[PDB]
Design a protein around this ligand. Sequence first.
Ligand code: HEC
Ligand code: HEC
Lengths: 80, 80
Amino acid sequence: NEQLAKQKGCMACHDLKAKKVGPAYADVAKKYAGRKDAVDYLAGKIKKGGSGVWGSVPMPPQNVTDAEAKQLAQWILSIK
Amino acid sequence: NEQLAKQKGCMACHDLKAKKVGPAYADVAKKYAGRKDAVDYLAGKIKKGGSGVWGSVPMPPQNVTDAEAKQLAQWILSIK
Ligand code: HEC
Ligand code: HEC
């Protein structure tokens, strides 16, 4: 039960339910750290959408330019 | 950049950084849905700790009785 989980400190490292469907940007940055094709890969994902890397729920295609997609990819890749 | 990510709606489905190291309970429940040994498995994980199912950061052993471990497992398995 939930009150026992709280009183035991469990909720310091767990949530009940994921608050966001997509991966956290720092986790994306870590997965793709050290890869020369990461910006091109991600900029295309962000623009066209995709599924199956992190799970089965898809990212819909996003309303960004190629420029904006590239920049978002560069920014996410710097997150730490 | 971050302001473009916000203005594009990206933060509806992403965080910058994971807020918790461990999996969300609803995700645990889904992974283990439909398994007769799930309560025994999880009660042991919660009590003894573990790593490598969700990632490499370990769950330390937790200060719970066997009773409490079993109940926490039963509760997490009901989360949806
Ligand atoms: C607004 C322009 C953005 C930007 C910059 C990003 N997203 Fe998403 N995203 C969502 C889901 C469900 C996933 C996982 C897809 C899969 O499992 O393959 C993602 C993934 C990403 C990534 C990583 C891509 C990869 O192949 O590793 C990145 C860099 C990313 N997104 C950026 C879900 C959503 C949304 C839900 C409705 C929304 C809105 C966005 N994402 C928006 C954006
Ligand atoms: C307080 C008593 C609890 C309870 C009920 C649970 N946890 Fe944790 N947990 C943490 C990490 C990093 C993981 C992943 C471990 C790996 O990758 O194998 C987990 C995992 C779990 C599970 C799922 C276990 C499985 O094998 O699928 C469950 C049911 C669970 N925990 C319950 C991290 C932490 C903590 C960080 C310091 C703390 C505190 C807890 N967990 C506490 C608890």
